[PDB]
């Protein structure tokens, strides 16, 4: 019966669905003997799981809480296991070399770098009162996973706070023993971990409340004095979990300041991390010298660098009279490029409020050559808010941004450095589509600070593209009347632009003569999008050869930038968009998807343009809205997008109807019509894209359809899509008229 249900939950191998299995469980009469099986399990997942079951059973369950506060010294030592399985005979020293060859992938080659020296030798639970006896035992088991399992269980017991059960009286005594005695670590990551001692110390943080007035904390800060980093470690992690209950802060902090200099990197890490949580007042001049020294060490990688940057950031935020020393300024430049992401993020957060040219320059380098976007966003945000960037920054990056798109940045233009943006081989990995993306982003940043004239030219394709747009931005600011900038002959450019002459002038015109035919030469095709780009940007805000650009552009970011320019100009009544609209709309409703990049940024501006009233005529219309309907579904002026929703029906256009669903108001129209005739086919592809609160309306009508044999397959199909959603909270939003049914029906379902 139920024992069968529990024995299938018992059955268990390999996944999170078993978490869902434990997430599933609720209330029963007795057994947990099977739970213990898990808490002794060697898996990191089962121990949690099992301990989670123990957590369920908390009521008026008795608990003894006598705590013997004894700091008794032990001579035990707790490791991974007893190691008795290491008393075995080692194979020949010939069979072994064979093994090393395999593991180190030394097939086909000779390996004579080991010798004889290298291979030498040195030197029953069923009763409940017995399920708690059993863990008190495991708290000190020689198998670490049993120790973890054991400790993980108690966390669960003391989790809830509210039969007869005495709790071990030597509990604390056992914790303390572990903390000083257990010497098991996980060195998998640079930041060391003490699986057992950790879980242990966390328990102590839950025990503390229900604990007699003690000298425990004073005792723990005593661990920081030990010569064994492992006990120090134990001290720090425990104190971390108890930091709330720490009084005599000055006495702990004094030691923490000391340990910032530990020879051991974990003690240094844990040290600073804990110190960030307490007031820093007296040691102020001291913890600054320490942290700066740690930062400057230039140890290629120390795990504590981030924690030290945090500690500085803190001192400087909490004491605004203090400012970073100009000399130490050159010690944080490297951090923007540091291989480790936590350092990069941390430094961009420590400079968020300062305005030094030097730092200004480094934040720009970041936006250009950063791997992670989330991190680039920090640097972008830092520059977009600026109206006082130095001219020499605008000028310098205005022509750094325009270097050849196939050569690396110059070590002479940057203070930062990576083998990914400065080597001729690194580039070809990043790909120009990124290199260009990240320039388009810096470009949107440096334009809000006054636009000096850039006389300096570089003469590459890209150089023209940007310096062109630059002048367009200038003109838009001074409402300069439009002058049809002149595009020279293909020849002209091939003479000036260093990036085009990496190509057979002849093969080039062939491509120009007819694209869609990927030329055989590898340099032309790329240089084709570089060209289509330049001309479009040169003739802007003429949009003749813009349609070309959108059709070939690989880099999605630039199409975005360009659409920005167009729209910015449109809003200022500074451009004519009509021909470009048409040519775009068409190219989009026919599979040229670069054009979406425009319609998203121009967005709702469409519905107030002549063209829109003229789209309610094209036979092309639904092919278009299919691809863009999300953009317009948000508008406030609903009567407008209204004419199109009527059409998606008439034409049973699923994609356009789904898009119209995320909005409530249109369900009201949909359902109020589905009841006049049940197109079950589309209902199958439509309904589940709306608010489920409506479903209870389709149950009776869908049964007639099956009762009498009508669309039997379809009806039955959707019917089993809707039934699992009958347990759904009806929506108060909808028309009070439709509640007169959502409730009328919803009622008859419980009738009786």
């Amino acid at each position: 019966l139920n024992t069968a249900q529990s024995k299938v939950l018992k059955g268990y191998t390999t996944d999170e669905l078993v978490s869902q299995i434990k997430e599933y469980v609720d209330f029963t009469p007795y057994i947990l003997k099977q739970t213990y099986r898990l808490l002794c399990g060697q898996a990191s997942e089962d121990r949690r799981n099992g301990a989670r079951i123990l957590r369920s059973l908390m009521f008026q369950f008795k608990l003894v809480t006598d705590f013997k506060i004894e700091y008794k010294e032990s001579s035990s030592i707790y490791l991974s296991s007893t190691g008795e399985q290491f008393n075995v005979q080692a194979p020949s020293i010939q069979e072994q070399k064979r093994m090393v060859r395999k593991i180190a992938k030394l097939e086909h080659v000779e390996a004579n770098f080991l010798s004889d020296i290298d291979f030498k030798a040195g030197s029953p639970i069923e009763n409940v009162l017995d399920f708690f006896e059993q863990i008190s035992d495991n708290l000190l088991s020689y198998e670490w996973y049993k120790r973890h399992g054991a400790f993980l269980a108690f966390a669960a017991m003391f989790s809830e706070i509210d039969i007869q059960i005495r709790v071990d009286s030597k509990l604390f005594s056992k914790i303390y023993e572990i903390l000083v005695t257990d010497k098991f670590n996980d060195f998998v990551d640079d930041r060391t971990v003490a699986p057992v001692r950790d879980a242990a110390a966390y328990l102590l943080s839950r025990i503390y409340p229900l604990i007699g007035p003690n000298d425990i904390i004073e005792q723990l800060v005593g661990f920081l004095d030990s010569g064994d980093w492992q006990v120090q470690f134990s001290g720090l992690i425990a104190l971390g979990y108890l930091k709330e209950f720490v009084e005599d802060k000055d006495g702990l902090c004094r030691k923490l300041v000391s340990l910032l200099s530990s020879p051991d990197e974990d003690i240094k890490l844990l040290s600073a991390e804990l110190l960030c949580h307490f007031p820093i007042t007296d040691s102020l001049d001291l913890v600054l010298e320490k942290c700066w020294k740690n930062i400057e060490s230039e140890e290629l990688i120390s795990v504590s660098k981030t924690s030290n940057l945090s500690l500085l950031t803190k001192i400087y935020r909490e004491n605004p009279e203090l400012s970073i020393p100009p000399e130490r300024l050159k010690d944080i430049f490297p951090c923007f490029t540091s291989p480790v992401p936590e350092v990069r993020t941390s430094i961009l957060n420590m400079v968020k409020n300062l305005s030094e040219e030097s730092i200004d320059f480094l934040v720009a380098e970041v936006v250009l050559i950063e791997e992670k976007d989330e991190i680039r966003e920090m640097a972008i945000k830092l520059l977009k808010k600026r109206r006082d960037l130095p001219k020499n920054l605008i000028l310098h990056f205005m022509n750094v941004i325009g270097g050849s798109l196939y050569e690396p940045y110059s070590e002479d233009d940057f203070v930062s450095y990576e083998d990914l943006y400065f080597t001729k081989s690194g580039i070809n990995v990043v790909g120009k589509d990124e290199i260009l993306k990240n320039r388009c982003l810096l470009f949107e940043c440096i334009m809000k600070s006054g636009l000096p004239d850039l006389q300096s030219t570089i003469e590459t394709t890209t150089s023209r593209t940007f310096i062109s747009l630059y002048r367009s931005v200038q003109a838009l600011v001074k409402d300069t009347p439009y002058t049809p900038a002149n595009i020279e002959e293909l020849e002209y450019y091939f003479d000036r632009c260093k990036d085009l002459k990496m190509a057979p002038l002849k093969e080039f015109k062939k491509k120009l003569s007819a694209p869609g035919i990927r030329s055989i030469h590898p340099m032309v095709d790329p240089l084709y999008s570089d060209y289509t780009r330049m001309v479009a940007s040169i003739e802007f805000p003429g949009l003749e050869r813009a349609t070309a650009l959108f059709e070939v552009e690989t880099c999605k970011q630039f199409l975005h930038l360009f659409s920005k320019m167009i729209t910015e100009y449109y809003d200022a009544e500074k451009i004519s968009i009509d021909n470009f609209l048409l040519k775009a709309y068409e190219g989009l409703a026919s599979g040229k998807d670069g054009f979406l990049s425009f319609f998203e940024v121009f967005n709702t501006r469409l519905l107030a343009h002549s063209f829109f009233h003229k789209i309610g005529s094209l036979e092309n219309r639904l092919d278009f809205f299919s691809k863009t309907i999300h953009i317009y579904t948000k508008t406030s002026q609903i009567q407008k997008i209204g004419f199109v929703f009527d059409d998606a029906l008439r034409e049973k256009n699923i994609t356009v109807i789904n898009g119209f669903m995320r909005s409530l108001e249109f369900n009201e129209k949909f359902v109020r019509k589905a009841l006049e005739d049940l197109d079950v086919e589309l209902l199958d592809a439509v309904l589940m894209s709306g608010d489920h609160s409506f479903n209870p309306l389709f149950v009776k009508p869908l049964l007639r359809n099956i009762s009498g044999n009508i669309d039997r397959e379809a009806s039955s199909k959707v019917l089993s899509k809707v039934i699992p959603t009958l347990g759904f909270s009806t929506n108060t939003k909808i028309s009070k008229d439709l509640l007169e049914m959502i409730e009328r029906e919803k009622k008859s379902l419980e009738s009786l």
Binding site: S80, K105, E110, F119, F184
Partner: protein
């Protein structure tokens, strides 16, 4: 010339110049595994650079998994760190790249039978035993695994130069046998 070789593995060693208690190191590190019946050393793994280190009681250290001479020396230094924390007077002497393994792809097929005849002395080719031809070059002492796919794999190199020097003695020959 034409294409560029890509590194897949680097083997290196160090002497921590110290007698290690292999058993202790096994019971003090969750990331180490130790099986005397299989092997008289301790296998310790870190996550980044994803690598593997063979630790002998003599204090000899074999390190594999690295994708560069930099990674190699780096992960090597991290394993020493763990030993020092673990209580032994470890040092870091005699680091040495023992082996490099790179790969290539010239994007076209090769007539193995032809290459093998023209060089029956330096390479063995039996397609009823193993797919592809194994070619033993003598200057530099490099072994190449050549497949019809056009894919090449070079091993036995002690310094990156040997990879280039060697994959430039074979290209001409891989040209003739398209």
């Amino acid at each position: 010339s034409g294409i560029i070789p890509t590194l897949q593995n680097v083997v290196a060693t160090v002497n921590l110049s110290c007698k290690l208690d292999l058993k202790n190191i096994a019971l003090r590190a969750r990331n180490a595994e130790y099986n005397p019946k299989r092997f008289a050393a301790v296998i310790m793994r870190i996550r980044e650079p994803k690598t593997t280190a063979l630790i002998f009681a003599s204090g000899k250290m074999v390190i594999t998994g690295a994708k560069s001479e930099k990674s190699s020396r780096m992960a090597a230094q991290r394993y020493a760190k763990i030993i020092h924390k673990l209580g032994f007077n470890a040092t870091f002497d005699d680091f040495k790249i023992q082996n490099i393994v790179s790969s290539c792809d010239i994007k076209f097929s090769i007539r193995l039978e032809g290459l093998a005849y023209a060089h029956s002395n330096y390479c063995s080719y039996e397609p009823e035993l193993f797919p592809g031809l194994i070619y033993r070059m003598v200057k530099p002492k490099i072994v190449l695994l050549i497949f019809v796919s056009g894919k090449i794999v070079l091993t036995g190199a002690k310094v990156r130069d040997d990879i280039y020097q060697a994959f430039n003695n074979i290209y001409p020959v891989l040209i003739q046998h398209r």
